[PDB]
Amino acid sequence: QLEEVKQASIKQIQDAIDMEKSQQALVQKRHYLFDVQRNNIAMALEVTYRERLHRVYR
Amino acid sequence: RKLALKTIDWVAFGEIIPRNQKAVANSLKSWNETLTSRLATLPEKPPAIDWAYYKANVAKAGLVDDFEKKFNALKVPIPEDKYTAQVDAEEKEDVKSCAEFLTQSKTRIQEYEKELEKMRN
């Protein structure tokens, strides 16, 4: 009697927990990525201006 | 422009699966770190010229002076964009990320919680 009830409880809260945790991640990671993606761009640009002043002046 | 302040949770970063980009993320991180190391170094300012010194001293002269005003006057564009669909290829995929999958995923989550209530009876 006792077994099947406890098996369903375990599986039930599991699919809950995992689904909300999976959800929380996809937002945050991607907000993540957006940080970086702009960054990786914009970085090289300033620099190129920067070094270019070097290069041409020399 | 200056620096962009985006903080990157690298944990979350690679993981993504909009599947045309998960591979890209793994590469893009490292592509980043190449760019990251590069910029972080580059010396911020180059020097400029003692025009007066060379003004005297270059005697195919007026060259330094011509150059002086013209160099002090000569200005510079700032390097183009390519790929900034990211700002947008974000937020819409973000609605997929968050809201669309979120809400559905919470809808799932609740049924198990309600049913763990039931299983508490």
UniProtKB/Swiss-Prot annotation, chain A:
It is found in: Mitochondrion; Mitochondrion inner membrane. The modification N6-acetyllysine is found at residues 6, 21, 29. Subunit b, of the mitochondrial membrane ATP synthase complex (F(1)F(0) ATP synthase or Complex V) that produces ATP from ADP in the presence of a proton gradient across the membrane which is generated by electron transport complexes of the respiratory chain. ATP synthase complex consist of a soluble F(1) head domain - the catalytic core - and a membrane F(1) domain - the membrane proton channel. These two domains are linked by a central stalk rotating inside the F(1) region and a stationary peripheral stalk. Component of the ATP synthase complex composed at least of ATP5F1A/subunit alpha, ATP5F1B/subunit beta, ATP5MC1/subunit c (homooctomer), MT-ATP6/subunit a, MT-ATP8/subunit 8, ATP5ME/subunit e, ATP5MF/subunit f, ATP5MG/subunit g, ATP5MK/subunit k, ATP5MJ/subunit j, ATP5F1C/subunit gamma, ATP5F1D/subunit delta, ATP5F1E/subunit epsilon, ATP5PF/subunit F6, ATP5PB/subunit b, ATP5PD/subunit d, ATP5PO/subunit OSCP. Belongs to the eukaryotic ATPase B chain family. This is ATP synthase peripheral stalk subunit b, mitochondrial. The gene is ATP5PB. The chain holds residues 134 to 191 of 256 of the full protein.
Curated annotation (Swiss-Prot), chain B:
GO terms for biological process: proton motive force-driven ATP synthesis; proton motive force-driven mitochondrial ATP synthesis. Its main location: mitochondrion. The modification N6-acetyllysine is found at residues 29, 45, 60, 69, 75, 82, 92, 114. GO terms for cellular component: mitochondrial inner membrane; mitochondrion; proton-transporting ATP synthase complex. Keywords: Acetylation, CF(0), Hydrogen ion transport, Ion transport, Membrane, Mitochondrion, Mitochondrion inner membrane, Transport. GO terms for molecular function: proton-transporting ATP synthase activity, rotational mechanism. It is found in: Mitochondrion; Mitochondrion inner membrane. Coiled coil: none annotated. The modification N6-succinyllysine is found at residues 75, 82, 92. Subunit d, of the mitochondrial membrane ATP synthase complex (F(1)F(0) ATP synthase or Complex V) that produces ATP from ADP in the presence of a proton gradient across the membrane which is generated by electron transport complexes of the respiratory chain. ATP synthase complex consist of a soluble F(1) head domain - the catalytic core - and a membrane F(1) domain - the membrane proton channel. These two domains are linked by a central stalk rotating inside the F(1) region and a stationary peripheral stalk. Belongs to the ATPase d subunit family. Component of the ATP synthase complex composed at least of ATP5F1A/subunit alpha, ATP5F1B/subunit beta, ATP5MC1/subunit c (homooctomer), MT-ATP6/subunit a, MT-ATP8/subunit 8, ATP5ME/subunit e, ATP5MF/subunit f, ATP5MG/subunit g, ATP5MK/subunit k, ATP5MJ/subunit j, ATP5F1C/subunit gamma, ATP5F1D/subunit delta, ATP5F1E/subunit epsilon, ATP5PF/subunit F6, ATP5PB/subunit b, ATP5PD/subunit d, ATP5PO/subunit OSCP. This is ATP synthase peripheral stalk subunit d, mitochondrial. It comes from Bos taurus (Bovine). The lineage of its organism: Eukaryota, Metazoa, Chordata, Craniata, Vertebrata. The chain holds residues 4 to 124 of 161 of the full protein.
